[PDB]
Structures are given as C-alpha cells and as structure tokens.
C-alpha cells in the first residue's frame, strides 16, 4: 500500500517467534500467509487469496544499500506515522509483505490448495524448482525455503543454511498453527 481479535490472532506473532526461537536448526525468518477473500466486481465470486498475515525476522552494493535505506526512511516516516546495512534476507523479508498468492499459485498458494508441505533444500532445489518466489529467495541468499499448509493459512520458513526436512519441525508447526 502506497504503493507496493481472537485467541489464534492475539497469539500469532508469539507463535511465530516461538517457532523460530524454539527450533532445532537455524532459521532466518518465519512468515504466516493468511487466508483472505476477494469479491469480484463483475460476478458473485469468493476467491481464496493468500496475503501477508504476520512474520518474525530473526537473522543470523553501496548503491543498492542507499536505495534500501531511502525506502526504510520513507516507510519509517509513513509508519510513524544511526544507520546501518539492510541485508538481503532482511530486504527479502521486507518486500515479502507486499506479496500475494491466488490459491494454487506460487509456493504458498501451491501449498495451501494441496494441503501440502513444500520443502526446498539447497540452492539447486530452489532455482531448479522454477517457482519465482523460490528463485527470489535464492537470489537474496536463502539456501532453504519451506511452506507448510495449516488450517488458517501457510507457514513459510526460510534460511540461508541448508536444512533437510526434519520430522520434528513438522510437529512444531502443527502444535503451534493447528488448531
């Protein structure tokens, strides 16, 4: 934009933080893509869209860097409402907030529609996948990207490290995002 009250909801950022901070491997961030509905102006249409729900960023040229700092100051001024580097993973995390996915489309829409876990481990997996969100993340330094369908949306995890599908992490996501 300009340009681009329940339990499970008051507790969302806490559950995202808990996922990241309480995890076996080193994850860079977690994003929750939420279910929203669009209604078409021409017809009666309930279309499922996955939008930005919330996120938790943990973490671990000069031309590009000052482009980034401008945006952050511009955003700062708009939101409220002494300067150091804006890293690639931070930037990817930031820009992710403007992204949306029609159900079935893109890594999260894919994941939700099929009630699926998509686990892309290693740079080869990310780029070889041919999905642009995976390619984007790989560009920005992520070596692992995960989407886990939950009852209210999709949990996205990413890391600049290579991480194989852990059976334990699956249980974590279920405990925290179902029900």
């Amino acid at each position: 934009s300009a340009a681009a009250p329940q339990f499970n909801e008051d507790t969302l950022q806490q559950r995202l933080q808990a996922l990241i901070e309480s995890a076996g491997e080193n994850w860079t961030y977690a994003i929750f893509w939420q279910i929203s509905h669009d209604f078409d102006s021409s017809t009666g249409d309930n279309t499922v869209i996955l939008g930005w729900g919330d996120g938790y960023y943990k973490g671990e040229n000069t031309a590009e860097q000052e482009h980034r700092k401008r945006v952050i100051r511009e955003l700062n001024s708009l939101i409220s409402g002494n300067d150091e580097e804006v890293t690639d993973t931070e930037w990817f995390f930031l820009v992710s907030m403007t992204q949306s996915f029609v159900n079935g489309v893109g890594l999260p829409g894919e994941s939700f529609l099929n009630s699926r876990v998509i686990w892309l481990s290693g740079s080869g997996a990310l780029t070889g996948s041919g999905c642009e969100r995976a390619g984007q993340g790989q560009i920005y330094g992520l070596k692992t990207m995960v989407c886990i369908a939950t009852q209210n949306g999709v949990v996205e995890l990413g890391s600049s490290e290579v991480i194989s599908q852990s059976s334990d992490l699956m249980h974590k996501v279920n405990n925290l995002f179902n029900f």
């Binding site: 919330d54 996120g55 960023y57």
Partner: peptide, 22 residues
C-alpha cells in the same frame, strides 16, 4: 485486513532495527 497486518509487522520490523542503537 491485509494492509493493517502489513502495517503492524512493518512497525515491529522497524522498532527492532531502531532497537539496535538504541
């Protein structure tokens, strides 16, 4: 609404940065 969730997560993102000075 999605723009609100955006504004909230962004505010928290900024705060965490503003907090490394502090």
């Amino acid at each position: 609404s999605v723009p609100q969730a955006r504004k909230a997560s962004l505010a928290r993102f900024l705060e965490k940065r503003k907090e490394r000075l502090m």
